[PDB]
Amino acid sequence: DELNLLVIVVDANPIWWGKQALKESQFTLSKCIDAVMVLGNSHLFMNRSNKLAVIASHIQESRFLYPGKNGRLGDFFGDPGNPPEFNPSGSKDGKYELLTSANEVIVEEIKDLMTKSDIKGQHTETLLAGSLAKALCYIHRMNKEVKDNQEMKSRILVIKAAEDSALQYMNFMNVIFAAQKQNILIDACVLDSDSGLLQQACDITGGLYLKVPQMPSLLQYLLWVFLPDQDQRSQLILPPPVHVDYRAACFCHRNLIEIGYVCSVCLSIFCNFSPICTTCETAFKISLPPVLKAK
């Protein structure tokens, strides 16, 4: 055999990567992505068939970093299959010129990302969620690129480096459940903080969640673990087994509860401290919601 596509979602929080520089770290964003770049190249080193998908999360957007939009790949779009008849970038290749075919296009576009420090949109932080589907449509087209004796083994990498943002919880959850339909592995390495929500997303996938041991020590686990195929992990006997995950609180006051109850037909399960519907101005039918208040 198959084509073996890779998807990579990298956290690029320039608030936090600026904060990565605020400690005057021995591991910076320059040191970050270059590992991730060769990590993307490492994918390519297993087979000529291998393909990549790399996007970061800018505060205003998430532009396709791999492979390219600009006039270096807006008219090029890769060499194998449907050729552009383009000579110079279509000439040099074989394990080292493919990477500088893609090295340029990230550092030029993160330049376009790190020239937009002009955020006034009230700390519009990590926009993972909408950034996720940007792959998922594209690989759907790439599914429709060729499938004829061509199994699309896509594999999704998520990289976390900072805190999650305040995004819509439904639009957090749904795409994973849509990825649950999509039958593609999603794996996650975090750096700074833990994401109970996104490790639940891992549990949906049965993928892999990772708290890094150390940010400069992110080159050997990243080598071993975040490494493809579901063959290298269903056969390589080494799984982070931990996945402690308690969940399930409610939304009226704040809790951590074993007993929920819905407020209206709208799927609004709230805390017990709730006389009248805060899901609507439609009143509750008076037989049941005081039985939540009866016993």
Partner 1 sequence: KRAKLQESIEYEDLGKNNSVKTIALNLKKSDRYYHGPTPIQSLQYATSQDIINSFQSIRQEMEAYTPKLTQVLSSSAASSTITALSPGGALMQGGTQQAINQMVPNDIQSELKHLYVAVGELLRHFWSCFPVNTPFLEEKVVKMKSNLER
Partner 2 sequence: SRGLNRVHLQCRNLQEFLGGLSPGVLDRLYGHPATCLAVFRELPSLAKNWVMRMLFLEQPLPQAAVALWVKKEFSKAQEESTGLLSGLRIWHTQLLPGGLQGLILNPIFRQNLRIALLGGGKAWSDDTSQLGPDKHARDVPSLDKYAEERWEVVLHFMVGSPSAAVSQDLAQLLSQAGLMKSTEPGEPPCITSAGFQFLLLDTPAQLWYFMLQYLQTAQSRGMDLVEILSFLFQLSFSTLGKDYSVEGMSDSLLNFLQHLREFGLVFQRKRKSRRYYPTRLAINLSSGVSGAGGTVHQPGFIVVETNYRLYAYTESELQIALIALFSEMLYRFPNMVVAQVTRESVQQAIASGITAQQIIHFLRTRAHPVMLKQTPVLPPTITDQIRLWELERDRLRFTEGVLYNQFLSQVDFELLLAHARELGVLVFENSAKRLMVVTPAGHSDVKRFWKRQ
Partner 3 sequence: RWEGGYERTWEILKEDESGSLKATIEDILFKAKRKRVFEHHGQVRLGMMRHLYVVVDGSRTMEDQDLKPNRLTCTLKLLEYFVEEYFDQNPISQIGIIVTKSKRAEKLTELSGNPRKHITSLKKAVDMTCHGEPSLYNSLSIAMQTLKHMPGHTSREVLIIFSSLTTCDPSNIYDLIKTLKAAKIRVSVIGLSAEVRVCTVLARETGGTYHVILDESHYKELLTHHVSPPPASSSSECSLIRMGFPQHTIASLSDQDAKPSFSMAHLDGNTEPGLTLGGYFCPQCRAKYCELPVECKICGLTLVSAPHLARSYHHLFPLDAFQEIPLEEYNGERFCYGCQGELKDQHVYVCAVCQNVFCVDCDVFVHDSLHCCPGCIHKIPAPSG
Instruction: List residues binding partner 2 (CB under 8 A).
Output: 34, 38, 41-42, 45-48, 79-81, 85-88, 90-96, 99, 146, 148-150, 219-220, 223-224, 227, 229, 231-232, 235-238
111-140: contacts with Zn ion (CB under 5 A): none
Q: Does 25 bind Zn ion (CB under 5 A)?
A: no
Smallest gap from residue 61 Cβ to partner 3 (A): 6
- HSE at residue 154, side-chain half, CA atoms within 13 A, is 21
172: nearest Cα among 123, 119, 226, 133? 133
Residue type, 222: L
Residues in contact with partner 1, shown as a per-residue x/- string from 61 to 100 under the rule CB under 8 A: ----------------------------------------
**Residues sharing a CB contact under 8 Å with residue 148, sequence separation 6 or more, in sequence order:** none
Q: Does 264 bind Zn ion (CB under 5 A)?
A: yes
Give the chain's end-to-end CA distance (angstroms, integer): 62
- HSE at residue 159, side-chain half, CA atoms within 13 A, is 28
CA distances from 233 to 182, 204, 207 (A): 19, 17, 10
Residues in contact with partner 1, shown as a per-residue x/- string from 163 to 182 under the rule CB under 8 A: xx-x-xxx------------
Cis peptide before 67 (omega within 30 of 0): yes
Q: How far apart are CA 295 and CA 285, in angstroms?
A: 18
Smallest gap from residue 43 Cβ to partner 2 (A): 11
Interface pick for Zn ion out of 102, 227, 263, 274 (rule CB under 5 A): 263
The phi, psi pair for 40, rounded to 5°, reads -65, -35
Q: Does 178 bind partner 3 (CB under 8 A)?
A: yes
Q: Does 248 bind partner 1 (CB under 8 A)?
A: yes
Which of Zn ion, partner 1, partner 3, none does residue 124 bind (CB under 5 to 8 Å by kind)?
A: partner 3
Residue type, 59: I
The phi, psi pair for 63, rounded to 5°, reads -80, 140
Which of Zn ion, partner 3, partner 1, none does residue 285 bind (CB under 5 to 8 Å by kind)?
A: partner 3
Q: How far apart are CA 186 and CA 201, in angstroms?
A: 8
Q: Does 255 bind Zn ion (CB under 5 A)?
A: no
SS3 state of residue 181: helix
- Give contact residues for partner 3 (rule: CB under 8 A): 60-62, 64, 69, 74, 121-122, 124, 127, 129-130, 132-134, 136-138, 140-141, 144, 165-168, 170-171, 173-175, 177-178, 181-182, 200, 204, 244-248, 257-265, 267, 269, 277, 282, 284-285, 288-289, 291-292
- Give contact residues for Zn ion (rule: CB under 5 A): 263-264, 266, 268, 279
